[PDB]
Design a protein around this ligand. Structure first.
Ligand SMILES: Nc1nc2c(ncn2[C@@H]2O[C@H](COP(=O)(O)OP(=O)(O)O)[C@@H](O)[C@H]2O)c(=O)[nH]1
Ligand SMILES: [Mg+2]
Lengths: 173, 208
């Protein structure tokens, strides 16, 4: 009888979906983790005084066709739309994930977070804070820059996404 | 004169967006600012550390300070406004660090009186940039000291929320090396918070 917040990691390949999951889970910066490797994780964390359990699906994505993708998009409760601040292509792609996620869940207000990862690579930034923050405002969601390397804001994105999921569960029931 | 104090978050945001859109900040000034918001603590700390002298700053930081300073030539408040921010006991002095508070969490009567004796009715020079907000947000509330800054029309002040790492909300930035007069210092009904009302006088850094 414990709350379970199912989080799904989305974003182009090589943006840091795995590193972020692993940094949050085992507090380590795992580099170049198998690109095509997918895995779900489930740990217990205390969210604002209350103890809950979080489930994180670290998607590979290279071959998750319509039926596979639709199933977990539909099952997932919260989404972390991750991209790399040093790769403009991954940022542009975030609109595709958003779109597909809202199409299957037939909802324009699902728990969602725009995450610009690799904030430690400021010298290679290709996406401006202004641009990303603006998009987040358009989608009516928060934008957070993280660094799976320095661990900056990693806990924040996962706990903030939960808070959004936990609140959406209140509106319903 | 009259001072515009925001009470509706949407009105505040709309207003801020209205000014920001007019700044016409270069890419470098925006970047300089985003960088300030990512490490305000280090930058302002280093500015206090040297009482404001920057000729000892590495090229990267000294370059950023210059951009920061001059960006204010583009950011002025069109009217009288009230800016808010919170601080800890160290703000009043090292000798307040572990003295300001009582064990029950309220401001200590004697500590407060010494605070007034030390600051009330006196100008104060801040070596670092002053980050504030257009409204009394939650980013504070749980802080021992609250300051209401009265910024007059035409003063250097810029809404930088569109490019900050959500350091609270409704981020407002004031120039470094500014002086202000503390007109009032009182306690809240709570008794666990000092409310400081001040008049912003301006900065000594006016390049260009
Ligand atoms: N500098 C830096 N590199 C990162 C960061 N996060 C991931 N990386 C690197 O970016 C590459 C892709 O990361 P990965 O976690 O595999 O991304 P995924 O494809 O979204 O799962 C790997 O070489 C990582 O070591 C970060 O925060 N900073
Ligand atoms: Mg991966």
């Amino acid at each position: 009888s414990l709350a379970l917040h199912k989080v799904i990691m989305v974003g182009s390949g090589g943006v840091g979906k795995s590193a972020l999951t692993l940094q949050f889970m085992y507090d380590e910066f795992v580099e170049d983790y198998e690109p095509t490797k997918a895995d779900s994780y489930r740990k217990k964390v205390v969210l604002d005084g209350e103890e809950v359990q979080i489930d994180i699906l670290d998607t590979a994505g290279q071959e998750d066709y319509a039926a596979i993708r639709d199933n977990y998009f539909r099952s997932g409760e919260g989404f972390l739309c991750v991209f790399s601040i040093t790769e403009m292509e991954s940022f542009a792609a975030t609109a595709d994930f958003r779109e597909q996620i809202l199409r299957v869940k037939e909802d324009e207000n699902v728990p969602f977070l725009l995450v610009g990862n690799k904030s430690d690579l400021e010298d290679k930034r290709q996406v401006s804070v202004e641009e990303a923050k603006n998009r987040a405002e358009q989608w009516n969601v928060n934008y957070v820059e993280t660094s799976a390397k320095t661990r900056a804001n990693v806990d924040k994105v996962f706990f903030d996404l939960m808070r959004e999921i936990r609140a959406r569960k209140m509106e319903d029931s | 004169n009259t001072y515009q104090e925001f009470t509706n978050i949407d009105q505040a945001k709309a207003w801020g967006n209205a000014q920001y859109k007019k700044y016409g900040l270069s890419k470098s000034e925006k970047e300089a600012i985003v960088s300030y918001t990512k490490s305000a603590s280090e930058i302002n700390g280093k500015l206090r550390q040297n009482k404001g002298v920057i000729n000892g700053f590495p090229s990267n930081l000294i370059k950023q300070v210059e951009l920061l300073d001059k960006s204010f030539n583009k950011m002025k408040t069109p009217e009288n406004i009230m800016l808010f921010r919170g601080d800890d006991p160290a703000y009043l002095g090292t000798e307040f660090q572990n003295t300001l508070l009582n064990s029950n969490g309220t401001i200590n009567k004697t500590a407060f009186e010494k605070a007034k004796a030390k600051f009330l009715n006196k100008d104060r020079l801040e070596y670092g940039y002053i980050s504030t907000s257009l409204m009394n947000v939650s980013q504070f509330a749980g802080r021992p000291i609250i300051t209401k800054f009265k910024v007059a029309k035409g003063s250097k002040a810029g809404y930088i929320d569109p490019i900050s790492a959500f350091a609270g909300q409704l981020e407002m930035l004031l120039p470094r090396h500014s002086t202000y007069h503390i007109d009032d210092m009182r306690l809240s009904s709570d008794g666990k918070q000092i409310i400081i009302t001040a008049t912003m006088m301006g900065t000594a850094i006016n390049p260009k």
